[PDB]
Amino acid sequence: DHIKQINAGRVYKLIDQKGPISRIDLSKESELAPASITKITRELIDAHLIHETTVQEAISRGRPAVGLQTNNLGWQFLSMRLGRGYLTIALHELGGEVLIDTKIDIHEIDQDDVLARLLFEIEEFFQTYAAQLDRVTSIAITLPGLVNSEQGIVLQMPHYNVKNLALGPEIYKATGLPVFVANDTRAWALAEKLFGHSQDVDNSVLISIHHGLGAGIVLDGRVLQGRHGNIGELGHIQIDPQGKRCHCGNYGCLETVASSQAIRDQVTARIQAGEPSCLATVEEISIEDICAAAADGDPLAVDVIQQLGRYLGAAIAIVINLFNPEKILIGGVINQAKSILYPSIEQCIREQSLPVYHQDLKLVESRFYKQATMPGAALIKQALYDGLLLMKVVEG
Amino acid sequence: DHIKQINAGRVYKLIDQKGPISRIDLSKESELAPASITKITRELIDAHLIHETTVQEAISRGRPAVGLQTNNLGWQFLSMRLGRGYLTIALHELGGEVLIDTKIDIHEIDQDDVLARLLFEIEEFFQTYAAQLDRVTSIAITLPGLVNSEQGIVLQMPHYNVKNLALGPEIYKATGLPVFVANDTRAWALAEKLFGHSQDVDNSVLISIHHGLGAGIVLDGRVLQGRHGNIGELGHIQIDPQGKRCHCGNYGCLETVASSQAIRDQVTARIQAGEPSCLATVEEISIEDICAAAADGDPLAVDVIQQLGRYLGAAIAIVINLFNPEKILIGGVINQAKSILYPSIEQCIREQSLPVYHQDLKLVESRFYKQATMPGAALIKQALYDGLLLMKVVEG
Ligand SMILES: [Zn+2]
Ligand SMILES: [Zn+2]
Question: Does B295 touch chain A (CB under 8 A)?
């Protein structure tokens, strides 16, 4: 099982990244014997996952012999996001590109009702888009919360009332397809490594700034997930010893000063105290509004964003110290004020981590944010490279 | 190569932990076909790494047929520590137990001279202990500093003047034996998982308190090392925003308050300022002296240890937040005052990490500290289980 799987993935990754490629070149690059290369490629050819123009075809039809390449056309997968009060279902081509996507509002809260609705929506999707669906190989689903990826179990999550929902097994039962379930921040860090702005390093950290604060840590080309998909959670690191009480019951947690709500609340408090701002007449201040005010030079909004940067910089300095990453990516709507935020983050990184660690350290914006299903695409790409999905497709 | 290797290690680990065991039981447990089990066990038997009493032997010699067991007797390895101003060479039996150990004082500083001395000492060891040496399979070496384990390269280290010393390749050239090189803190965390006080969990953190402060992080049964063997370094995390200048040039680093030197310096300063203590007449105060004073009820020493615990607790709370470990181990001479230190650490853990994360969280003393070569023993045991060393032994 795991025997063939690993080598099949290694060979397929070489073909995907380096094709058209000869069997002899695959043998040299993979360090596998020609006999092994032959057996692996034959299974992949017969499954129509890869293709070549053979010598016999070349002579027969009067065109050049061409080395092995991935045969993505016709192959597809579903990538889903279970978000706060909604479900996104997207159809992707195997290479990762979105073909169709729909966002469905979800007013269910309790586990059984959420699951019933989600399966109904998958069924409806297959019926509605039947003509555009071809060879669907798998389903990926990403979501906030505690997720056991190995088992496909959501232990608990924001918004919904969930306790150990067997999301992967349930979707697999309803579809017969392999299902890949992951925490969204962790899967997003993988998408940045496979498709995004951390392709150039094997050691990086993605900092997700939204409702909560989380780091998706890539070490040696793979994301750290853990049994609960929570490796890298930043929100309950104490950053102010004498700070506000957190929902967790402790004081001075990062999320008391750096969550979307905490930033909006700060702006609201300073305006109420009589600090001047272009936001002082605005109803229902959003993070977008704050970022647009700061970007446009509003002293109060600038100051609020800089303070946020200092706190983020402190948390990021911690991660740098522990992981020695080669790159830092920032993701979230807060990137709309990056000209203001980044210098604040960077100065605190310089002051709170080793010079040698942060010397050539790029601080950059993530490629993805509103592409909610690209994280699921990354899970599928990595399952092809791990050989897991290849064997499922070969097996039938 | 990697094909056979992985399965050979999986089978060998089953035999080591569960033998005497039948081939059918190995087939069921490993999920490998009998044909594969046969091929793997045959190579391991012929290499004399495992043994059984076959049916033919049982009938022939009138004793019971006995399932496969590891055949450790006769097999050995060397485990070395390059410490500050010394080299320890120990001969171990393959199961991990020490047979001979010697500590050699080393007054060399520069890379070339250090390496020349170390190879001379290995040569001398083989000659001196020739009668006690049997089948030496490998050499493990652990040391403080930045270590690339994959390559066997020491990038830099304390005490010695080192820059990218190819320690593994050089020892391999001088001996023909496989060489396993690792950072000492990381290899120690592995020894605790394989031989020590974290055998019962797959997710743990070892906190090493000595010259520096480091966490050896075990995730899913394996230690996080990184390309530089420095994943988990704690010493330059800023724990006091308005603190002492560190050797790194930044202010308020953990090692400014928690290194062995910083503790001794605190005691020295408070006595000079006129604070009463049983240590106030003692020349050359050691950490052992401070711990013995605290354990014996000296108010000043107690207060110094409690303050240390608060700072360690803050750093450990950070690691808990990021990793959600199932167990925390503390290693170092400071364990001589654990009755005083641990409650201080624990209260700060409660106040600076999620209740759910630290509820059933045991804080315990490490099994090893003065067993300087047990970390190297762990590297060898894990290389057997990974199958790497098995294949080297089979290959001849
Ligand atoms: Zn909190
Ligand atoms: Zn420092």
Answer: no
Residue B335 and residue B308 in contact, taking contact as beta carbons nearer than 8 Å: no
B259-B263-B269-B274 Cα dihedral, nearest 10 degrees: 170
Which residues of chain B does A7 touch, with a Cβ-Cβ cutoff of 8 Å? 3
Q: Which residue of B has its CA nearest to A31?
A: B1
Pick the CATH number of A1-72 from 1.10.10.10, 3.40.50.720, 2.70.98.10, 3.30.70.20: 1.10.10.10
Give which of B57, B26, B88, B55 is closest to B377, Cα–Cα.
B88
Residue B387 tokens, joined? 């199958």
Cα distances (angstroms) measured from residue A53 to each of A50, A67, A75: 11, 7, 20
Exposed, middle or buried by CB within 10 Å (0-12, 13-18, 19+), for A267?
A: buried
Q: Answer yes or no: are the C-beta atoms of A225 and A183 closer than 8 Å.
A: yes
Q: What are phi and psi of B234, to 5 degrees?
A: -105, -15
Contacts with B236 from chain A: Cβ below 8 Å: 321, 353-354
User: In chain B, where are the structural domains located?
Assistant: 1-72, 73-198+369-396, 199-368
> Which residues of chain A are within 8 Å of residue B216 when distances are taken between CB atoms?
none
CA–CA distances in Å: residue B373 to residues A160, A278, B74, B87: 51, 66, 20, 11
- β-pair partners for A146: A156
Which one of the ligands is nearest to A236 CA? 1
Tell which residues of chain B come right before a gap with C–N over 2.5 A: none
Q: How far out from the chain centre does Cα B323 lie?
A: 19
Looking at the domain covering B73-198+369-396, what would its CATH class be?
alpha beta
DSSP bridge partners of A233: A214
* Beta strand residue intervals within chain A, DSSP E: 50-53, 66-70, 75-83, 86-93, 98-105, 135-143, 146-148, 153-156, 179-183, 204-209, 213-219, 222-223, 327-331, 362-365
Residues with Cβ < 8 Å from B276, sequence gap 6 or more?
Answer: B299, B300
Q: What helix, strand, coil percent values describe chain B, rounded to 5?
A: 45, 20, 35
Please confirm whether the linkage preceding B375 is cis (ω < 30° from 0): no
Strand partners, B51: B69
Q: From CA B328, how far away is CA B309, in angstroms rounded?
A: 14
Closest Cα in chain A, distance from residue B287 (Å): 26
Other CB atoms within 10 A of residue B396 CB = 5
A238·B351 Cβ contact <8 A: yes
Residue A354 corresponds to which tokens in the numbers above? 């080793």
Question: For B356, which residue in chain A has the nearest alpha carbon?
Answer: A248
